[PDB]
Design a protein around this ligand. Structure first.
Ligand SMILES: OC[C@H]1O[C@@](CO)(O[C@H]2O[C@H](CO)[C@@H](O)[C@H](O)[C@H]2O)[C@@H](O)[C@@H]1O
Ligand SMILES: OC[C@H]1O[C@@](CO)(O[C@H]2O[C@H](CO)[C@@H](O)[C@H](O)[C@H]2O)[C@@H](O)[C@@H]1O
Ligand SMILES: OC[C@H]1O[C@@](CO)(O[C@H]2O[C@H](CO)[C@@H](O)[C@H](O)[C@H]2O)[C@@H](O)[C@@H]1O
Ligand code: CU
Ligand code: CU
Ligand code: CU
Ligand code: CU
Ligand code: CU
Ligand code: CU
Lengths: 345, 345, 345
């Protein structure tokens, strides 16, 4: 009895996002998405450590889904008979039934269809939540993604001026808890079930062994650096389903930041580092002003450099010597300089 | 020489709150409260683990005290001779003398009366603070609560519209540090004094063994679930005196959230997860739109599911199929479905 | 080809700040600062524990640099030949080249001159960032400070009223990771190089051994307490380059707080505890209303009392009995009192 145009959306693998319009004059639609659970071993660091992962659509994070305020979202969740455990899905964007968790529990070999109305604008987390201690275990094993619900008029700056992005990326950050053997080496398992008890012991101490973007250390570095151009307005959506994060664009700023991730609230301007609370998504706009390599990190630098949480942007364009310049290149300290006279010696 | 009506308030045990008016046309009063320290063993988890607790009024958290801006708050603190240690009280709502800590130090068998003026609106923490390493130890042993100072006109949305709650609850979150024996079992002690040295060693590593609401794992689940009704505006006050928290209503939102907890600042709207900084109280409004069970958690899910930090709301009313509906119940995956053709396989 | 007045600034050791104007009618200048790297052993706690530190200008934190929006900042970085490692500098206030890190790498015996334009107002972190795992190691060894870029009209309250401070202090908070021997005693090293491998193992677990303000436990207590007077508006700038902090003035409030530290955003009013995200600086105003000792802490009380993160303010003036008063000093509990009748017994 819900009589609205339907539209099928094909999701893509993060950090890219499926095609969508920002501002729209189209009325409300039923937007149809399909997610298939996949349990599999994945590599999570540059030394080749492996991990028994559980994913939506084979990726960590799950794909970003984009709809407009007032749309209805109809999700088919599929749990193929190759999987070993029950799974479900809960959307933080949705209202009732534990975000839909209470309506979507499916055994291997089954599927379910849930519909929810997109009544609140912003970016939101979605994750598996089977019940009890299964909940943290599914989420930290990789079963979490995000949804963005745009206002029909697109983003604005909270002072009645429109904001438009040229480019969008979705960075999902994941905390992982990998057991070690007596000698400190990471342990390997043949199934998720088998990893469980040792993993639980690591989770209980609340300290991750890895903190990764897009599912592995180095995933968004080297040849998979993110691309941009001087002058472009880039939206970066950042989610963390379980633990806090402090995103920082090294060499840049957050021009407009919705750190709690909800478009009904005016963004903050000109931030250096912002804060994603565990269990939420945030979004930041930035207009690149200078070419070159930028590092996008969590600004716990131990986690960024040593546990895996660094992505790269490669930005093409012309350098602006007004903003920054090397006045004098590295040179010998002058013989006639007197730094030994300074207050602190 | 302070000539104002006096009024005695009877406190109640959390998560309930003593009777009060929201908006008031009464002038400033002296509001008189009494707190009695109690040291005692308490059960803190579902396996029956016990802990040497120190409390105000026998509860963790201490009772919520509610007054209006401009009131004077006169607190009698009582330390009965059955207790073993000196205690005091500091209010984050108050100005001077370390929030009153410097005026309220009492040995067992003594009492003291402090008066402070409620000049700043919001929710605030109160806690014991005897001096030095005693401070964290008293607080994490349970000696902390909150006070709410309402504007005389009641809450507003920051755009000049009144906000009124139908129902209020106070959730105090507590981090606990319970020593373990060689074999990993939790240790038991006959006095707070005796637990001290082993507890200090656990505190120094900054990782709690339990994170509980209203003093124990499961305290606000089962038969002590919180009650509400579709349509009701519920205020949830959340405090954490020592460590950060990220509250999340599973299946719901924060309609209006004062995450730093101060009513002079306009609330944020439509949050998924909010953030209580350690050493503070926050407050969130929500109007229930759907019946059923909701879980209120910190959205570090390891802490929520495995360390104790989950409460339940049971909400009566009629389900709204517009907001959310199960279109197709769990069913076998169709033989003629082709999920093996999807981008991620 | 940049034709502007130059002005040399002499930095001073934190928590004090070099002389500057708040509001200015002067046009843009080139502001010239010099920083010299110093590697040396420092004492970091009250038991005399030592640590292989790396600093800018011999202090942890580095000096606060103050300029106005539109100024150009020209920094000479000097790495004397007594040091053992390459170092550089990155400013979060600057745009491009990893905040200048990519232009400032200097070996011992060398110096470099970088110029950046101060286009964004607020307080910002600066830190060494040589590349890879060297980055967290340099920062947590002490190589980080802050810069404040003031609006030309000075601070305002976000509702078009001017804010002026009578007094400014810079509190840099530092997380430290000191290795322990088998018996739990802190280990000593003869060089930074030698401490490295053991320090890395401690950093990987993400739990600091010390959390200190101005470079050591007790640095801003006793005879080095900070000074103020009843009636004065004091600006406290707080930075943390690597880990989150929750500042709290015990006995006071944050009258006006820029917790994300950026002056383009209206401050919050009347906070009890605020939140500095790791990798950022924040600023808070407060007008002292009462004389006496105040403690400025991070409100993780374990860290404040047990790991080193407490400073003192000593405030002169007259006590205001209206705001707070001891109505009845500590006294025996009356024989005819009946506390045994209270709801919680
Ligand atoms: O109190 C009525 C009773 O109805 C139940 C049956 O399980 O379901 C209601 O809520 C569901 C979502 O939780 C809807 O799918 C269903 O249509 C609705 O009738 C119970 O939840 C509830 O106890
Ligand atoms: O500098 C004056 C001197 O007076 C003291 C005496 O202890 O107390 C003042 O402040 C108290 C609260 O801290 C008030 O109770 C008292 O009435 C007031 O005179 C000292 O704190 C201070 O050194
Ligand atoms: O793409 C052009 C090329 O120029 C380089 C040479 O290293 O430098 C540009 O950016 C520098 C700052 O990163 C400026 O100092 C320099 O003036 C500018 O030409 C490369 O970064 C870049 O690949
Ligand atoms: Cu699952
Ligand atoms: Cu969730
Ligand atoms: Cu106490
Ligand atoms: Cu406190
Ligand atoms: Cu360095
Ligand atoms: Cu940085």
């Amino acid at each position: 009895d819900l009589k609205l145009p339907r539209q099928r959306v094909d999701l893509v693998a993060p950090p890219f996002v499926h095609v969508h319009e920002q501002a729209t004059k189209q009325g409300p639609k039923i937007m149809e998405f399909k997610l298939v659970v996949q349990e599999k071993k994945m590599v999570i660091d540059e030394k080749g450590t492996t991990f028994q992962a559980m994913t939506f659509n084979g990726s960590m994070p799950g794909p970003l889904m984009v709809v407009h305020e007032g749309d209805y979202v109809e999700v088919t969740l599929v749990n193929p008979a190759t999987n070993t455990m029950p799974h479900n899905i809960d959307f933080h964007s949705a209202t009732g039934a534990l975000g839909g968790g209470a309506l979507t529990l499916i055994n291997p070999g089954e599927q379910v269809v849930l519909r929810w109305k997109a009544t609140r604008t912003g970016v939101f987390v979605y994750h598996c939540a089977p019940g009890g201690p299964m909940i943290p275990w599914h989420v930290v094993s990789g079963m979490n993604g995000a949804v963005m619900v745009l206002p029909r008029d697109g983003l604005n700056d909270g002072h009645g001026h429109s904001l438009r992005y040229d480019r969008i990326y979705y960075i999902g950050e994941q905390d992982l808890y990998v057991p070690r053997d007596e000698k400190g080496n990471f342990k390997s398992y043949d199934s998720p079930g088998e990893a469980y008890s040792d993993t639980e012991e690591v989770m209980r101490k609340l300290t991750p062994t890895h903190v990764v973007f897009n599912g592995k250390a180095g995933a968004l570095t080297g040849k998979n650096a993110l691309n941009a151009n001087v002058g472009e307005n880039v939206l970066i959506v950042h989610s963390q389903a379980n633990r806090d994060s402090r995103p920082h664009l090294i060499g840049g700023h957050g021009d407009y930041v919705w750190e709690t991730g909800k478009f009904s609230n005016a963004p903050e301007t000109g931030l250096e580092t912002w804060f994603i609370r565990g269990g939420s998504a945030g979004a930041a706009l930035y207009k690149f002003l200078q070419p070159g390599i930028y590092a996008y990190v969590t600004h716990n630098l131990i986690e960024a450099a040593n546990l895996g949480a660094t992505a790269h942007f490669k930005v093409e364009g012309k350098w602006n010597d007004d903003l920054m310049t090397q006045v004098k290149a590295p040179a010998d300290i002058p013989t006639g300089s007197t730094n030994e006279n300074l207050y602190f010696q």
